[PDB]
Every structure is written in C-alpha cells, then in structure tokens.
Symmetry: D3
Subunit: 137 residues, 6 copies
C-alpha cells in the first residue's frame, strides 16, 4: 500500500491532473486497488454542471489508468503510455461525497505491453469499467 506523496515519487502526474489519492493494495504483476476522494472542492464541478455536480466519466478512466501506472512501474526513469481503451462503459453518476474506488487487474502481460481489466466502484456499486492497453518506454 502507498500514500499520495509516494505515488507522486512514481507517477509524474501532478495537481490538477493527479487523480489517485491513495493505493490500498498492490500485488506485483497482478492487481492494484486504490481510490480518489470526490469533493465539491474539486475545480471540475465548477463547470461539469453548474447546479448539478457530476464527476466526468473520462476522468474515472484516467484514474484507473494512473493506478495501473503505479502497478506497472512497480513490476524508474521511463514511461507508461496508455495507447488504448476498450469496452468502456459508464453505469452510474459519481457525485461529490463519493469515495471512487479503482480496481485494476492484469489480463495480459507481454514484454513491454500490459492489458488491464479496470473497474470503478462507489460503495460496491460498479460505476465504470474498461480494458486498458499500455506500453512502457
């Protein structure tokens, strides 16, 4: 498991595009679990619907991708490029107050290429899912 300053020692992403607050579980070459707290203190809600705050779907995918990034990196001067997303589905809205849980499993690993099954939850409710393809450089 891994806190945000540690994440930041691994991923190059910084505010305002760092979308993982904490990694709770990490099994090398296998699976990673982490989350992002969602709050109206978040600048996105200013414009992702005045009077109706909804966490943008595409940012959930980015959060998944970033969590997968750390899993990749743990399995460190080089880069993790996500070149593909497939079968992405959004289920329910994510709102201020939700803890957005990310789950990322390795489906395939071949030299420098990684394929993940990713899912996002809020209170055990699936909200998003997708298969992400990554490359390392």
């Amino acid at each position: 498991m891994i806190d945000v300053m540690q994440i930041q020692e691994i991923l190059p992403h910084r505010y305002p595009f760092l979308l993982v607050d904490k990694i709770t579980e990490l099994k090398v070459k296998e699976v990673v679990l982490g989350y992002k707290n969602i709050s109206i203190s978040d600048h996105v809600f200013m414009g992702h619907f005045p009077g109706h705050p909804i966490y943008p779907g595409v940012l959930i995918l980015e959060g998944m991708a970033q969590t997968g990034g750390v899993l990749a990196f743990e399995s460190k001067s080089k880069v993790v490029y996500f070149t593909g997303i497939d079968g992405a589905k959004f289920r329910n809205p994510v709102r201020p107050g939700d803890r957005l849980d990310y789950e990322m499993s390795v489906v395939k690993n071949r030299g420098n290429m990684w394929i993940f099954k990713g899912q996002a939850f809020v209170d055990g409710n699936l909200v998003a899912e997708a298969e992400l393809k990554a490359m390392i450089v």
Copy 2:
C-alpha cells in the same frame, strides 16, 4: 443523506469555500453530522506544503462552522444570516491528509434566542483530529 446541491440551497457558501460535501444526520436544535472528502485534487495542497500535503487546521474549523450553519438554518420554524463570532478551546490533534474522509460533529450546548453555542469535533476513522466550541448569531 443531504447532498451539496441541497446544502447550497441552505448556505450561501460556494466553491472554493464550500467545505461540506454531505450532511448525514440532522436532529433539529440538537446535533448535526456531516463530512468533507479530502483529496489532492484540492487546490489548498498546492501551497499547504509542496511535497507534504496537510489540510490546514483552520479549514477544519470552517467546515465545522458550516455544518453548524445548516443546523442553525434548518431550525427556524429563510433569509437571516448565521454569523460565527467566536471560537474557543480549539485543539488540533492529528494531521488530515489527502484520502481522508473528514467527519464533522456539531452538538448544541446552549441556545438562547438568536445565540448558539456548539461543541464541535472532527474525526478521521474515529480518530479525533480537531475540536472547539463555536459561538454563533443570527440577523
């Protein structure tokens, strides 16, 4: 189970100074429970310590205050204002960090006409992180 759209119907506070994400429990004239999610997506961490994100204690107080605002407002048999004129015995126990759910508890210790006194506490996973008594008014 009272969300931000509805909190903003009650408080005039807006982003970037709305410090309550949800109110979970509200017993009129008595107690209010609510919380804020703490995330690195919060601009305060940009400056409240590069390479060392810590939620500023003073904002915990303000969140407490805002929660108490809601209780105050939702307890008048509309348009008045809730002015917090005092804070006492404020104590900061442990750091609040990105990833924490910051839980507020505000109980009314005294109420007389338009004056309210609150016992306030903030928690993360059942761990006291802040406390204070808050004095409020009405217009």
Copy 3:
C-alpha cells in the same frame, strides 16, 4: 456553423470542462466538425507534466463526445433532453497533442436507433490522426 456562445446554448458544459471552442461544420443526423485550441494557458499543463506539456488523451475523448453532443441535440425532432455517453470502444491514441496545436474533432453517425446514437470519432492535428474511438450515447428526457 456555431461559435462558443452558441455551443454554450446547447451544451450545459462550462469552463473548466468545456472542450470545444468552435463547430465548423454540422450536417444533421450525419456528421459534425469542430475543434479546440490547445495552449499553455490551459490549467491542465500545470500538472500534466511539469516541463513536458502533453494534452491528456482522455480529454480528447471528452471533446469528441461534446462535439457529438451538439450534433445529437441538433438531430432529433425541443430541448431539455440530456445526452449521456454510456460507452467508448476501440479508442486509440496515436500522437501527443501539444500546446500550439489546433485539435480537430470529427464525429460521424454510424448508427441511430430511436434514442441511441453510435459515432465514429477521430481527432486530428494538421491532418494527422491523433486519436479515435467509437462513442455510444443515449439521449433521454
């Protein structure tokens, strides 16, 4: 066709998550062309790589999506319906998009069935494909 103030009349999106600056072409029920100007004035580059500004791929998807929104809202038989994108498929990122780039969106309708829309989307910079995806949307009241 449509400038930013007009898009804002159709789309509910506002800054900081309005990712279309202009719609240049719009043929109802068929195809929409629009773009976003990419500049270091953009807050994303603060954190999407200090000393290495790269436009986040996921945001290119959302710009495609917002363009397609406009097309949909212009494409049935009133207003306040909402257009929810429920799926994205075969999304591919080709080349980095950088400050200075005009990011060109193209969205064509591949299927339309009552309240369901399916788009082929592509984004370009000087005629170079940078991203593509199939977007599924549901338009509901």
Copy 4:
C-alpha cells in the same frame, strides 16, 4: 522589516495559502507586525459570497499564525517546523472586505523551551477586526 520572497525564504507556505504579504517590524522573542493586502483578485471571494465579498474569519487566524511563524523561526541562532496546536478566545469583530489592508500583530505572551503562546490581533485602519491566543509547538 521583510518582504514576500524573504518570507518564502523562511516559511514553507506557498500560493494559494501564503497569507502574509509583508513583515513591517520584527523584534526577536517579542513581537512581530506584518500585513496582507485584501483584493477581489483573491480566489476566496468567488465563493465566500457571490455578490457579497467577505474575507473569511478563519483566514485571518491563519495569517496571524503565519506571521507568528516568522517570528518563531527568526529567534533561531534553520530547519525545524512550527506547528500551531491551539487557538483560544478567538473573536471576530468586523468584516474584512476587498480594499482593506489587513494588519497583523503578534506578541509573545509566554515562551517555554519549544512552546510559544501569542496574543494576536488584526486591524483594518486601526479597527480591531479579530483577536485570539495562539499556541505553537516547534520541533525538528
């Protein structure tokens, strides 16, 4: 008698949570005077009241605290941290508005090894706007 950059040369606080613009007077182990310019160019007013800009009281406290931080750090003779662990008898008098120069005054009432107790006051044109007793720790 010090300016913003020198201040950053001392506190680790940065924008958008650096609430002191300038320190006007500094007597070691004794008292510190500094101020913050208040302007609608400040992000806080966007949300601390659409159509009614009021500088949040708690930010006045933090500005006092930061000023006291400098005084604490200046009584050295490097790298330690200044933790404010308590605030008491904090009272807010008048609203602080865009256009105000917010004057901080911080005196040491007690000093005990690594613990400091300050009387803090904030002014706008010589009008008391806030006050409190601030308790500070100071560790490696």
Copy 5:
C-alpha cells in the same frame, strides 16, 4: 466613494479580471481616483516570475482603463451601453509593482466629444509614479 459590490453594478468585469478594488473619489466628467491591492494571493505571481513577483505592467493599464470605465458610465442620460477602449498612447512603465503595494490609479478627462473620451492616466505606489498613459475610449 464607491466599493466593489457597486463597482460590479457598473462594470461587467468579474474575477479574475476585475482590477479595481475601490473607487475613492469620482467627480463626474472630470476625474476618478481608485486603487487595487496587490498581494501574493494574486494568481498572476505564480507565473509572472517564480521567485520574483512583479505585477505585470499591462495589467496596470487595464486597471486604469477599468477605473476610467466607471467614470465614463457615471458621467452618462440612457443607462446600459458599453465602454470600449480603442487606444493607448505614450504608455510608460517606471518602477516595479510588488506584492504588498497599494496600486493607486488616477484618471483625468483630457477631452470629451460626444461618445469619445480621452484620459490622462497615472498609477502610483506611495506617491511614486509607476506608470502612465493616455487612453482613448468610446461608449457603445
């Protein structure tokens, strides 16, 4: 004698491009005095020189312009029109403006002809000229 809330009843400008905090004096068709508080709370310092906060000269010109806007709007007998600044001449920048400074604007009418206004503008800190320019405007 006019503050921010009132300023905004007149100017359409909003944060983060509202560069007047207060108007201290206004004599119709003649002169306007107002100012902006400069503080590191201001986002411009983030990038107008990390480790060296300098208030951009062009923003001083804009603040002058905005203050003249108020004077123009106030001196007029319809109601809602717009004040378009079409020109700036002999603009000179003298001294740096830094966090902590009160930036004083002064705008005098040198010419007025129907819907055209020409202003002599000056900006000060502590009575030191920091910028000046002649600004031409048109009401629409």
Copy 6:
C-alpha cells in the same frame, strides 16, 4: 522554429502569464513571428465577460512584448533581463475570441546598444486586430 519549452528556457514567464505558444520564425536583430492559441479553456474568459468571451486587448500587447523578448534575448552572450519601458500608438481593431489563432508580428525599427524599438502587430486570419510600438531595455 521555437517551441514552448524552448520559449521557457529563454523567457522567465510561466503559466498563467506565458502568452506565447510557439515561435514560427525568427530572424536575428530583425523580425520575429509567433502565436497564441485562444480557447475558452483560458481562465481569463471566466471574468472578461460572463456570456461574452473577449480576449483582453492589454494581453495582446503582452504577447507581442513576450515575443519581442525572445527576439532580443536571441540577438546579442549570457543572461540579463528585457524590460519593456514603453508602448506607443497602440490601437485595438477587432475583438479576439475563443477559437482564434492570435498571430504576433514584431519588427525591429531601431536598435541602439541596450535599447530596442519594435513595430508590433497582431492578426487573426490575416486581419489586423492590434498594433503598437514597443520600447525595451536590457538590464542585469
């Protein structure tokens, strides 16, 4: 020819006050061409007119100035600063709006030791939208 991280090695300006995205042509001691992409992603539109995004004229001047900065820095062999002390005959023609590419053009009309005079013009699809004469000096 000069990309945005090249600009930043040269200019000290950073976001949110770096107003050049690219330099397309640079002839030493003669002329520089570069541009800025204008988008509603830009925070200025938040406040430079709710419901009516218009790129502030004074910021066009600053973009011109920054572009001329690079030219100057590229045309003499160390580190020093480029201070713009004057702007003259500045004229604003048409509004600049989200979606426009804002084209800068800076020619040297005079050069004497440490002093530069530029003729500057800004274009959007070949239409002049602003122009001015910029005076600059180079210091420690």
